[PDB]
């Protein structure tokens, strides 16, 4: 397929909404014979200037490959997620989906430089360890 590097970040207090939406999104990607070549959560990090209030956000780096169709339902959904503040999806040309430049800095953040607090327990419930409410 064509390779789409989706990275996005999430507001902490509204973050509880995204853990149910990401796991339907990863299933729409592998359900179409595209791949999740990593799915990296980085934890909570400081924004330099605020976006949609608060000077902090919680980061997920997908490393997608997917067919063009599938990416048309997904982009419109992550962009209209309230829990997400912003997302960016990058080009097919000369594109990496393996060997992360920020793999060490992600581990460092997750292990040692995180908030370590209850509003960020809400963020660890939104990373790779996703838990979400029953409807």
């Amino acid at each position: 397929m064509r390779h789409y590097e989706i990275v996005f970040m999430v507001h902490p207090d509204q973050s509880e909404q995204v853990p149910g939406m990401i796991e339907r999104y990863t299933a729409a990607i592998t359900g179409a014979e595209g791949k999740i070549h990593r799915l990296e959560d980085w934890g909570r990090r400081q924004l330099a200037y605020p976006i949609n209030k608060l000077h902090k956000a919680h980061y997920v780096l997908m490393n997608v490959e997917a067919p063009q169709e599938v990416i048309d339902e997904l982009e419109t959904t992550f962009r209209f997620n309230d829990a997400v503040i912003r997302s960016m999806v990058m080009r097919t040309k000369h594109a990496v989906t393996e060997a992360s430049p920020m793999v060490k800095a992600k581990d460092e953040r997750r292990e040692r430089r995180d908030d370590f607090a209850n509003e960020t327990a809400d963020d660890a419930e939104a990373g790779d360890s996703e838990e979400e409410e029953e409807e």
Binding site: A48, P50, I51, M88, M90
Partner: peptide, 22 residues
């Protein structure tokens, strides 16, 4: 040319300061 694009993708996610006042 590819970096101009990349630096802006990055600016809009507050991975960098966009403006000197920050």
């Amino acid at each position: 040319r590819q970096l101009a694009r990349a630096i802006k993708r990055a600016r809009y996610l507050s991975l960098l300061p966009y403006t000197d006042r920050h």
